[PDB]
Amino acid sequence: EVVALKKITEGVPSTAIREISLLKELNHPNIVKLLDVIHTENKLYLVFEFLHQDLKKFMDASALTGIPLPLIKSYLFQLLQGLAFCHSHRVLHRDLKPQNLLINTEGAIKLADFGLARAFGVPVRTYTHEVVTLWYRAPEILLGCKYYSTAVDIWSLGCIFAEMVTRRALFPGDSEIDQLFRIFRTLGTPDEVVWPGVTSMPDYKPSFPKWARQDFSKVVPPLDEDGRSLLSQMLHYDPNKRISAKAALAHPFFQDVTKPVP
Amino acid sequence: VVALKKIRGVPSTAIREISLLKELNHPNIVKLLDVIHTENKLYLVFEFLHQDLKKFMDASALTGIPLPLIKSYLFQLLQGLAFCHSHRVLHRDLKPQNLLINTEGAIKLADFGLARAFGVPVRTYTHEVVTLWYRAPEILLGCKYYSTAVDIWSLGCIFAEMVTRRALFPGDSEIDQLFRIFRTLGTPDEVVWPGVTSMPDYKPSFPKWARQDFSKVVPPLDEDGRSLLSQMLHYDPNKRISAKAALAHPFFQDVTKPVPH
Amino acid sequence: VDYHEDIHTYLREMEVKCKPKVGYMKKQPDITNSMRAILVDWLVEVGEEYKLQNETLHLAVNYIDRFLSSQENVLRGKLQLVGTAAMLLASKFEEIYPPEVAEFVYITDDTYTKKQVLRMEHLVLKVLTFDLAAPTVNQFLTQYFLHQQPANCKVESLAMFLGELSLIDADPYLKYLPSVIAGAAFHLALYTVTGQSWPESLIRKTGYTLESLKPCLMDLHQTYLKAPQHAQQSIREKYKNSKYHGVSLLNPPETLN
Amino acid sequence: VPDYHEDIHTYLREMEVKCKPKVGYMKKQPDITNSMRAILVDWLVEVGEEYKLQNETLHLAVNYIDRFLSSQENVLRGKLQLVGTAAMLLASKFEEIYPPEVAEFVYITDDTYTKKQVLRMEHLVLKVLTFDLAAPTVNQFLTQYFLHQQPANCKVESLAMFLGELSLIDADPYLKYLPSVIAGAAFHLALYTVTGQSWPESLIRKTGYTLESLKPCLMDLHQTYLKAPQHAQQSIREKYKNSKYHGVSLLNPPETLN
């Protein structure tokens, strides 16, 4: 009986059309369940399974101790499984952030809020610019590139991984140009060697400052060699070399994963 | 937003529950937010409430529900009931599993499935309705007429059950239920209840029990609390206290709104 | 007696909301008051066959009137299916053991199938929006009776008889509230059996004088005088029985003053 | 290549078998015809061109129209354009960055329909399709097959898209064939016309379709291509004259396949 209920001059909005049609094809333990759709002339309801709390409220209630490392490993393993299932079913999510990730009491975590999702092609065309919440937005989008696809979702998960470990947002920018500079200060200013084609993209400029790359032992003190290795592969500048959700599942970091209860 | 939600010709229980609940707008009655009807499914959308009184009582088995909170809950329940009876509605299935509580200190009547509108005066309605433990003697003795009094009886059972943390009258069958009531309140006769000897399922054979002092039945209650309970468990349903008059009992002179755990 | 007064106040509030428009039939292009009279007459016969309560019949007629006030074009071939569903809904609301759906088919002589009755049920519930707890003439009568102590059974049955006669004739009874027809019906019953008038206690309760009841009392006196000649006769048949004290056999009074 | 292309193809091949109308549904539709449908789709092509909409958006709208007319009974001829307008509005909302306003879909129908009538038809189409709007198209399969051209040939891509577009017009016979099969036949026929080549071996392993299994559909498409200058509906031939499409609709079709 206990469920979560979404209650929706241009008729049915495009966000709802996309949310329902995509979410009803996705059946996976780590994707929130759409139980039912209630459709009349006057009103339209989405009935979702009830989940205890979002990851943002859990991180805030855990802020003194942080989330134990084993539970961070469990949550990232599950989120990569759900994301891999999305990308296997031609779905980009495009708004991964802690408020859209829901947890139960038994130790599970699930992707939710598919309102800004869309079905992608093989190969991809140009899609809507300036997607994803600023703090979790990948450099491809900031720099205004013709094409983006699955990689933008892996960027967002990398920002969320670091945020679970440090207990603060990794790149908390105030504007597009402030977000870019905060990214460049931690990972270094990109160039043609590490990211071929970067100086050709529409919103790049040669006047950008050149910061050296920082050791990840300073960006993420609590993590071991394997965790730093995975985070740096999820935050690769070139979206062609950024690790996939599927390949990330097989990383040495997950070779001792358990399922602890929050 | 989080909701309680029910799915499923269209059943008599749903016709009664929707038609009656949508007239009952009161802070101590579960809010029916919306009803969506299709040529396939019928949806009842209710406000979300934390947990039922039965689950709170068990989770409170260590300390028992404290008295200030018991007084608050009974006060609010009687306000909701008073409102029901005043818009000609009988609940007819009051039990701890159908009373829902929030974190902020509120309690509310829920599950109007077995409910119905009553005329003034009342006809014979459904032969036996309330769950055995909470069922009034007039129903067990099989009287033609029952009314508002059956809801006050059920509530009187819930009052004692909060205070002692166990069912007052937990009987197996209809004749076992009476014998458990008769043990505590004494065997009724023509004096206390003008009628009993007439009524269809009464027998002269019925065994005798002397009345038990409420000092033992519900020990931790003060004089005022014991007075209110005997006025809610009175045998004759014409003389049993109403929800309205119960609100004016001196037990409630010092009522407040405590927050649960 | 402390709920009897609050319930009468509440019922008086809701009888103005659970209302159809008087001039609905002239807009309903394929139906007349004449056809309505024949359908309400038929449901009485149904009531008797399945020993249904009088309240059930009063509720069904309320649902039918409100449904024709709302829906634009009802074909006369559908008018009996509307009636079958209205009575099914009322039986589910009001009866302890409502007759089965198969039973409500059996009485149409397989005019309409099961599918069609469940389909018409749904349409009615959507139009009315589950607002099925309507005040009736019956509910108001039942309240007035408590002011004759001890009860006069002959007055009660004759008041119910006259209230049930009001259900047949849309013209004129649609332009009177249930509480008013109950007042007119009780005073008419009381005067024919005992010679007594609308009592002081029910004037204090309702705030209705006998002047206020006059328009309705004079329409109901005429229906009662010429009920012997009416095309519909199921109600008179009903109330000849000893269950209702044979009150339809009583001669009406010639004058009221 | 990305480690989910294989998975996406397998998943589309599974789902194309499900979003399915019946061959000759039009015979159980008494007031409308294949010819009235041919006129409707040729008009949607023009609407596509006027508002600069994606080819994917046209392919989805046609999918929505055939599934709707397969389910609802007695769609009258004065409503057939309103079904079409509602299908293109929904496909626009699903697939486009900047969908045209409701006011634009009223304006192209020159006020035959009110705004309230277009929103009621949108509600009705969504109810009949149960929000299953993410349907596989010929376009989606062609786009995947085009990657097996090395190097990339945009003249072949343009003829392939043109032939797939021609197949939307004619319910008889293209309702008989799955989108994956129509894409296969279109790609081979474009390859053979422009380049002299055939359905490649890399696509025989990927799809499991031999040249022999494509032959029924390929013989129907060859006749559509030969006969296209004489067809009553001409909006697709005019669209693919443009230099954007390398003027492929002006190319001489091959007189034989073998």
Numbering used by the authors:
A (entry chain A): 28 to 35, 41 to 294
B (entry chain C): 29 to 36, 43 to 295
C (entry chain D): 175, 177 to 432
D (entry chain B): 175 to 432
Please quote the authors directly.
The SCFSKP2 ubiquitin ligase relieves G1 checkpoint control of CDK-cyclin complexes by promoting p27KIP1 degradation. Cyclin A is required for DNA replication and, in S-phase, associates with and activates CDK2.29, 30 Cyclin E is an alternative activating partner of CDK2 that is predominantly expressed in late G1 phase. Cell cycle transition from G1 to S phase is tightly regulated by the sequential activation of CDK2 by cyclin E and then by cyclin A. p27 is both a CDK2 inhibitor and a CDK2 substrate and the balance of these activities ensures appropriate cell cycle progression. Signals to arrest the cell cycle during G1 are executed through p27-mediated CDK2 inhibition but, following checkpoint resolution, p27 is phosphorylated on T187 by CDK2-cyclin E and CDK2-cyclin A targeting it for ubiquitination by the SCFSKP2 E3 ubiquitin ligase and subsequent degradation by the proteasome.
To characterize the molecular interactions that distinguish these various CDK2-containing complexes we set out to identify the SKP2 binding site on cyclin A. We show that the SKP2 binding site on cyclin A (the “SSMS site”), distinguishes cyclin A from cyclin E and is distinct but overlapping with the cyclin A binding site for p27. To verify the ITC results we used SEC to confirm that full-length SKP2-SKP1 does not form a complex with CDK2-cyclin Amut5. The structure shows that the insertion has not affected the overall fold and the kcat/Km values for each complex towards this substrate were comparable. As expected, cyclin Amut5 bound tightly to p27 but cyclin A mutants W217K, I213D, R293E and L297K showed reduced binding to p27 (significance calculated at p < 0.05). Immunoprecipitation exploiting the FLAG tag followed by western blotting revealed that whereas a robust interaction can be detected between authentic cyclin A and SKP2, introduction of the mut5 mutation abolished binding. Moreover, compared to wild type cyclin A, cyclin Amut5 has a reduced interaction with SKP1, CKS1 and CDK2. These results demonstrate that the SSMS site makes a significant contribution to the stability of the pentameric CDK2-cyclin A-CKS1-SKP1-SKP2 complex in a cellular setting. Our results confirm the formation of such an octameric complex, and further demonstrate that complex stability is dependent on the integrity of the SSMS site: no octameric complex is formed when SBP-tagged CDK2-cyclin Amut5 is incubated with CDK2-cyclin A-CKS1-p27-SKP1-SKP2.
